Scaffold this active site. Sequence first.
Site, PDB file in Angstrom:
ATOM      1  N   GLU A   1       4.244  -4.708  -0.116  1.00 47.94           N
ATOM      2  CA  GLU A   1       2.903  -5.258   0.881  1.00 47.94           C
ATOM      3  C   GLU A   1       3.285  -6.672   0.744  1.00 47.94           C
ATOM      4  O   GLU A   1       2.505  -7.154   0.837  1.00 47.94           O
ATOM      5  CB  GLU A   1       2.087  -4.822   1.099  1.00 47.94           C
ATOM      6  CG  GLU A   1       1.331  -3.812  -0.036  1.00 47.94           C
ATOM      7  CD  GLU A   1      -0.017  -3.705   0.352  1.00 47.94           C
ATOM      8  OE1 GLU A   1      -0.774  -2.619   0.784  1.00 47.94           O
ATOM      9  OE2 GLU A   1      -0.881  -4.499  -0.177  1.00 47.94           O
TER      10      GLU A   1
ATOM     11  N   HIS B   1      -0.817  -6.572  -7.766  1.00 45.68           N
ATOM     12  CA  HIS B   1      -1.354  -5.563  -7.678  1.00 45.68           C
ATOM     13  C   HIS B   1      -1.470  -4.990  -9.149  1.00 45.68           C
ATOM     14  O   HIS B   1      -0.944  -3.954  -9.562  1.00 45.68           O
ATOM     15  CB  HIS B   1      -0.124  -4.467  -7.278  1.00 45.68           C
ATOM     16  CG  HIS B   1      -0.213  -3.244  -6.703  1.00 45.68           C
ATOM     17  ND1 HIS B   1       0.490  -2.232  -7.028  1.00 45.68           N
ATOM     18  CD2 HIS B   1      -1.983  -2.620  -6.697  1.00 45.68           C
ATOM     19  CE1 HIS B   1      -0.039  -0.622  -6.869  1.00 45.68           C
ATOM     20  NE2 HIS B   1      -1.814  -1.303  -6.505  1.00 45.68           N
TER      21      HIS B   1
ATOM     22  N   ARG C   1      -6.087  -2.014   0.425  1.00 40.20           N
ATOM     23  CA  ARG C   1      -5.028  -2.159   0.727  1.00 40.20           C
ATOM     24  C   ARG C   1      -4.723  -3.881   1.963  1.00 40.20           C
ATOM     25  O   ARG C   1      -6.077  -3.887   2.843  1.00 40.20           O
ATOM     26  CB  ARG C   1      -3.832  -0.932   1.890  1.00 40.20           C
ATOM     27  CG  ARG C   1      -2.943  -0.391   1.090  1.00 40.20           C
ATOM     28  CD  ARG C   1      -2.868   0.981   1.542  1.00 40.20           C
ATOM     29  NE  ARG C   1      -1.586   1.482   1.239  1.00 40.20           N
ATOM     30  CZ  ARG C   1      -0.659   2.116   0.317  1.00 40.20           C
ATOM     31  NH1 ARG C   1      -1.683   1.555  -1.153  1.00 40.20           N
ATOM     32  NH2 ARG C   1      -0.011   2.710  -0.146  1.00 40.20           N
TER      33      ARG C   1
END
Lengths: 316, 311, 314, 315
Positions: free
Chosen positions: D263, D281, D234
């Site tokens: 995010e 991602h 993350r």
Amino acid sequence: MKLAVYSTKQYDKKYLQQVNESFGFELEFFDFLLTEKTAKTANGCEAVCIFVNDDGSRPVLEELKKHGVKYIALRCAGFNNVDLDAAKELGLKVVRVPAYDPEAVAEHAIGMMMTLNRRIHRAYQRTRDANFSLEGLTGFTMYGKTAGVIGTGKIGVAMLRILKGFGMRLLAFDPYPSAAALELGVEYVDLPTLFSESDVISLHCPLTPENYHLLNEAAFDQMKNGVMIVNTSRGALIDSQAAIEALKNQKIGSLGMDVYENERDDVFRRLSACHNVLFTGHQAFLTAEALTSISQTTLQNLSNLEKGETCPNELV
Amino acid sequence: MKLAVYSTKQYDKKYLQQVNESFGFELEFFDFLLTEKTAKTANGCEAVCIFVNDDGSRPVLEELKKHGVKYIALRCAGFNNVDLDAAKELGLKVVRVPAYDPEAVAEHAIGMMMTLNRRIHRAYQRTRDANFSLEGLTGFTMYGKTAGVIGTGKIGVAMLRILKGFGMRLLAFDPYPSAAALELGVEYVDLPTLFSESDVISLHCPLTPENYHLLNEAAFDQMKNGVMIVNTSRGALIDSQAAIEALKNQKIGSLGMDVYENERDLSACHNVLFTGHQAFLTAEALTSISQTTLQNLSNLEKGETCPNELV
Amino acid sequence: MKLAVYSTKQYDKKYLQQVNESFGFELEFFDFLLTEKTAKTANGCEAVCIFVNDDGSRPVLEELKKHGVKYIALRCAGFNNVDLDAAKELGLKVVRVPAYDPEAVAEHAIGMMMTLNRRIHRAYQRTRDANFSLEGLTGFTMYGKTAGVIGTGKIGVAMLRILKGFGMRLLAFDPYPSAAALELGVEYVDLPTLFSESDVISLHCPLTPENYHLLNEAAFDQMKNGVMIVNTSRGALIDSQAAIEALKNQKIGSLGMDVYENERDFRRLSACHNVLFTGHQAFLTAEALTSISQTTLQNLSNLEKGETCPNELV
Amino acid sequence: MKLAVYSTKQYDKKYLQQVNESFGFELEFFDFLLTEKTAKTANGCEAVCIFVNDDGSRPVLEELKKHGVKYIALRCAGFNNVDLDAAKELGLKVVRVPAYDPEAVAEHAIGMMMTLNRRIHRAYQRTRDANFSLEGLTGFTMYGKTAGVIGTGKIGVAMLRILKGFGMRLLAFDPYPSAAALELGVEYVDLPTLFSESDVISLHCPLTPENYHLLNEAAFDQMKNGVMIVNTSRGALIDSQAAIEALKNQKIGSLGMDVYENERDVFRRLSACHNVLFTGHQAFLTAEALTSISQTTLQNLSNLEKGETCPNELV
Ligand SMILES: [Mg+2]
């Protein structure tokens, strides 16, 4: 005659070879810079042909003269890399190309302006990888806007002709108004009016003491928000630092600069990434026809010298 | 009224919002395509606003009518994606934008042309990473070359005005010559003369049965070697397969195409440039599109006559 | 001694300067190619330092000798550009770097392989302009697949150590199998088994007459569809024309090639296939450039003191 | 059953289709986000399949239930976007994919690292246009350097196995030493020793309160100049502002970040001006890992349809 050509790029070679079909010089092409250490590679040549990064300071010119060189031909208009007084003292002739094809240069400036306007440089980066999103690519219709041209020599007038074709209102600044510009309907104004009224500004003037850093904080201060600026003249007409600030601030909407090869000062990387900024590497004269004229004049200059004829492009 | 806007891009949203300051519609912006399945999202709106990929076939129009929609506004000139007979039979009104700002479009075409000419797209890919080599970037001086414009509607004429300013010789082809072009000194010629004489060619004409694949092998056959071609009109004016072959062959020097909003929507190998139907993408031209769209809807709401009504 | 360095890049200059802190030679750096015309620029130097494009044919060597040059140091392993017979006849010494840091080269090859696998080169082109779409970027999990390494010299064994870390089944082919590979769990097999069983193949072998065009139509024919091929060894191990065909055919899923300077005989297959070229970059690390510089300057130091130089070619 | 798939990307469609060949569900693919307004599009489907940006708050779940939906399948491990209490109260089932192929993720991290090390991303930009200059592309030999892995779960151990293969000295930090790591020769150390000794650092740890902004000014302060950092975990494990400052002052030599969809410019500037690489991602984006996700997803839904017990049921 035998000619050594320094700082040779493939396009320099191609047009010098082509044009030399009418002259029959023996051409020797070097891809490296003329420096005090490489000047000995001109041995056996009566002439060298140099461009803007080559070193024509006194120690180099001395080394050329010791190796029998008589003539120095700049394949360009600028001559600040040559010590002309030293050349004159040493008996060496220096010739140059008096100006580039003014239409090639103006057309490069419009090309930069439209690429910036419609973000075509960004569009291509997307579409070459099959991304057809148009977000962020929005431009402005040129028709009906106001263009300001600073300098109305032959290049600036060539520019004004093009801008007229776009249907733009034409403003100019120059100490000495040009008749050809006035036939196009151009309105001469003072710099403050040009700054404040112009949607797009393009510089087409020589660098002088008076106009060094002509576009500085005070200039940008007076411009419209989102103004488009193109500079195909010398870099020093613009105060870089003030430009970057006015970019960040969002006073300048787009900036295009044709960056001279000895004026380069990753400001380039950041500004190219984060803003509508476009650099080209002194590409304004890079057309077949303009490179042909440069070669023609260069080899005609040398032909003059060899036959003792008068050379209108002789600097010394 | 309440207006559901499909296929919304940020620029669509910006100019519709700006222009809606004069109208006060309630605007509901969806970023997705109108399809038979998403039509139900328009429930509570009297109007939808759609663009070229949205689906206006019968089954979608049936769904819109069931959910209370009365009006369909195309924020564009084309209407091939809408079944006008079905719309008429269902009692739905269809409005459109009759034409784009012809100067925006012509200006995009000249942009494409100069970008290709001077390889400025390739320059930027170098210079953004501080590579200032000019090798491979050589172009040509436009001044004194010949330009051929195919189609002399308002856009084509706008193009000719710009080309005139470059100091080019101006040739055109159109079945029905235009007075405005003649004032620019344009010489109308037949297609074979245009092909053979032109250094640069730009298409500014509607797609018709007769000019479908107008630029095919036989056309390219007659053109100068290194010819530059820009197409901001419909992609089908050009026979793709023949173009690629004439590119490999080196008949075509450079090709620019503003590829329709989904017309299959290369760049690597040759001096080829695609833009994604970008020719009307300016603030002014998007403003006109939004003005006309909201004015078209205001007309319908008040029962006024709408010059842009298709049905 | 005084050393003239030709075809100098910034990285060449950086590491020669750094290493020269232990030797104290006077270094003269030129950015241009050594040719018959530029050889005169070496006047006053006992030594020149050249790389793979510099011209060391007989006329250039004649001119060096006339200008007082005694020693020629290749900052590289290849010596194809130097006429060694002519050098020997003229009395000129030629030294070289016998091999590159094998881990640098293997590590480049795995870099190519993973860049290709995960399309990270294409991802960067997108994300540098804040496009985060992943379409077209799908790769494959390496773990549990089979890797085939052709050539188990030091570089190939370095490569196999890395591939062991990825948890791949390791196959290799070499005419002289190496004991060092067996520790890694490598199974030596014949070429046909390597071709048919391998998900990724990497070449780490010198070019010899026997393996010239080793990867040709018949080789590709036997490989799995979608096979990944990386070549950090010489380009002639591969038959280009057969590779392109197998790419278009979709036999080869991905191809990486670290293309040597004198083997440079790009846009279309970079464009339209998962193909990646690098410019003979496999030894381009700080540590490996340091070794090349150390050896080069040590080679010259040997010659200057009359000591025996193990890296002398003539 | 009939399944409506929201936020569908091309690869989602490809693997769900492939895997569905053995289940025979009727699949309906939508490219847009599930929201309260688009939930009505699921009418006629018993199930929806959603990913991390889709809205599963109560008003959406209410609308799904009104339209006949019974099952919600997350094709991902995170479930932060779904109100599980509200789902439970409404009688809706929620399933998920418990974890991604740890090797796919570690491999992406190493791929990022080596791309950055050898500037292969910059190389390709040059070579696709036949520029073979190597200036600026100098990397570092990994062999014999020190690697620090923060977090030694399955992904981190998968990463340490690779790094062992490069012949690196292996340091790790984790509150709980893992046996599998120790058999690789890993030395567990405290964060300050990891920061100060590591040539490359890779994060493989869940985001918790205590490690939120773990890599901040004080961390960077202690690292070696030119350190390489890769984050496939993350984004919040790193204090973005401190990283940028450590990039500018040249503490960080290279930074790779796999940036999550929920995010996400700073991206452009850093990508241009430094050895910085973002991926979108992409760490689970392989054929094998996408196949597992689709398999588990369709198998989860099959379990529900047949009343079987589903180990991946959240609600
Ligand atoms: Mg199938």
